[PDB]
């Protein structure tokens, strides 16, 4: 199937004392593999998946140098933005950055991204052409003219179509035992009476990977959204995910209702009904 | 692998 590599960075200013709090995380698909936290003791990029631990000292020293340099860029940016938006030195503000690449089933480049936000709102983003910029307001328009003059999109395009995809392929190979394994959802249905004549049917999908999944209810073979509830996909904590969908039904009529589960690990979607 | 030098805003 398709794969992705993504890095996420958050910096939160601390006007009271000291430097911003900085947290960086790296993912391959839905698997975290590296982290940096400015509050942690190591002051190094740290492994979070077994398959990245084999990387040598040059890798760890290099990623530590680069992630600390990213933290300093965010620190400077928080100051610049406070100036661009004419804000007080007294409040805490946040910058967020995400970048990475997607490859298809053949592991060839599909798309690249580099997005930045200030205080939880879009600031500037590289367009899908990897040449152009989306600036949300006039402060970001100032950044856009600066980054056009500094050949920034060229540098990002070279990384996104080159380094990013090359290293994603390396990680997919090194971590093949888990990264290239799909864990189909383990499904079951539960029944919870809500009165002496109606009940909730809850369709569960457990221990699946990757996180993408679709759960839908049908009644007599047509989609049912009335009297249904669908929770957000949630992490189990062991690297897999969970979700459920529920419907309220008249007791005795449970056989009319079917839950349909779609996932990359299922060659054909599953259909579940309540076991009377 | 991370990007290297970033351009400030």
């Amino acid at each position: 199937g398709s794969h992705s590599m993504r890095y996420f960075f958050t910096s939160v200013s601390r006007p009271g004392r000291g430097e911003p709090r900085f947290i960086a995380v790296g993912y391959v698909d839905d698997t975290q593999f590296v982290r940096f936290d400015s509050d942690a003791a190591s002051q190094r990029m740290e492994p979070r998946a077994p398959w990245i631990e084999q990387e040598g000292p040059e890798y760890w020293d290099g990623e530590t140098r680069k992630v600390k340099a990213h933290s300093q860029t965010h620190r400077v940016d928080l100051g610049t933005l406070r100036g661009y938006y004419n804000q007080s030195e007294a409040g805490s503000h946040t910058v967020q950055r995400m970048y990475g690449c997607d490859v298809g089933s053949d592991w060839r480049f599909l798309r690249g991204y580099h997005q930045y936000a200030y205080d939880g709102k879009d600031y500037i983003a590289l367009k899908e052409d990897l040449r152009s910029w989306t600036a949300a307001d006039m402060a970001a328009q100032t950044t856009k003219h600066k980054w056009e003059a500094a050949h920034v999109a060229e540098q990002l395009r070279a990384y996104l179509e080159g380094t990013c995809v090359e290293w994603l392929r390396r990680y997919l190979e090194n971590g093949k035992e888990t990264l290239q394994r799909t864990d189909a959802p383990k499904t079951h249905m539960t029944h919870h009476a809500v009165s002496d004549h109606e009940a909730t049917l809850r369709c569960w999908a457990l221990s699946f990977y990757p996180a993408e999944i679709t759960l839908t209810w049908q009644r007599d073979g047509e989609d049912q959204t009335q009297d249904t509830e669908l929770v957000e996909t949630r992490p189990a904590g062991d690297g897999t995910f969970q979700k459920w969908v529920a419907v309220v039904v008249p007791s005795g009529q449970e056989q009319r209702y079917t839950c349909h589960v779609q996932h990359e690990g299922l060659p054909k979607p599953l259909t579940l009904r309540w076991e009377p | 692998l991370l990007l290297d030098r970033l351009n400030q805003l």
Binding site: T10, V12, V25, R48, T94, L206, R234, P235 | -
Partner: protein, 99 residues
């Protein structure tokens, strides 16, 4: 922007009384990132609680998983307590093994 956290409290494995498991509190959809999350056993704070590294969604809102080992029983009540700048008072969500 200030976005309030969504909360789910649930076990890693289907719960069976007397069998060890893991209690999760998944907080998501919030902004800014500073947040206080505790897992409770009979209204009291559980001390050995860990959490994931801060990350965020496409819409820039943050998410975290807080977790600890626990053993469900017939008598004990478990819950997650969340405080955030968007909340007037801490929000307590009781764990229900069926959800």
């Amino acid at each position: 922007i200030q976005r309030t956290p969504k909360i789910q409290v649930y076990s890693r494995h289907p719960a069976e009384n007397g069998k060890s498991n893991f209690l999760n509190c998944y907080v998501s959809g919030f902004h800014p990132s500073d947040i206080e999350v505790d897992l409770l056993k009979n209204g009291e704070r559980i001390e050995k609680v860990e959490h994931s590294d801060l990350s965020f969604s496409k819409d820039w809102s943050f998410y975290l998983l807080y977790y600890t080992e626990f053993t469900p029983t017939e008598k004990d009540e478990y819950a997650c307590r969340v405080n955030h700048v968007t909340l007037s008072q801490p929000k307590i969500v009781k764990w229900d093994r069926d959800m």
